[PDB]
């Protein structure tokens, strides 16, 4: 799915998810690096 740079696609929920939700994790999506 097409998400803006601040989001990433989760295919279980089939939705763009905010990167901010993943920033505290040691392992955020690679595309969330810029935002986080």
């Amino acid at each position, epitope marked *: 799915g097409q998400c803006s740079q601040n989001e990433y696609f989760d295919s*279980l*929920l089939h*939705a763009c*998810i905010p990167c901010q*939700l*993943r920033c505290s994790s040691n*392992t955020p*999506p690679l595309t969330c690096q810029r935002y986080c």
Partner: antibody
Amino acid sequence: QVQLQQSGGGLVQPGGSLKLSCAASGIDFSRYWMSWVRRAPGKGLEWIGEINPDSSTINYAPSLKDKFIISRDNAKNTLYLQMSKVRSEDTALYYCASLYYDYGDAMDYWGQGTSVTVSS
Amino acid sequence: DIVMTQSQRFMTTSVGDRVSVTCKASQSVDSNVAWYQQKPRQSPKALIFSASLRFSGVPARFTGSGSGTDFTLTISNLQSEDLAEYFCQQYNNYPLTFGAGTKLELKR
């Protein structure tokens, strides 16, 4: 209140067919992907498949792709599982689910479950 | 098809303790991992998606971690109501596949 109401299972003989129903209310059914999973006696959870909102994408567990047909009727807010050529392995509790992300939250809703027993 | 291995079919624990359930993917699944809870005679409940993110309504004592092949569901301060069976799942590749399940029980 959200309710996935399941109906339509029960007893069937080997080789037979059964159509399970999962009727949704309290959510915009038409926006979301819908899933089927089952739990057979002595086995863990088994994914059966999932169908997108407009039914153009349907994915199945490979062992079930030629026995089971997943469909939906958004005008009735209902998800179906059509079972055929059933066998003892298909005796199980069948659950429908909707997993989605909307209004800023990740949501999961489940039907109450439908028992199927395949037997002579 | 990706195999999700929960090496511990049972885990012994105590109310109040921290418990971690492991799950190992047969090949890399990035962070595309979910965890579910199921009790006898009840529908499953989704706990975690994206390896570390809770579904709405899931208590903060449930956390998830991992990326690649090794994933862990942790319950801090276990409550009696947390005694149940836990399943990991990968959704990196269709078909989605479940692990075999880890049932918690109490030490005595």
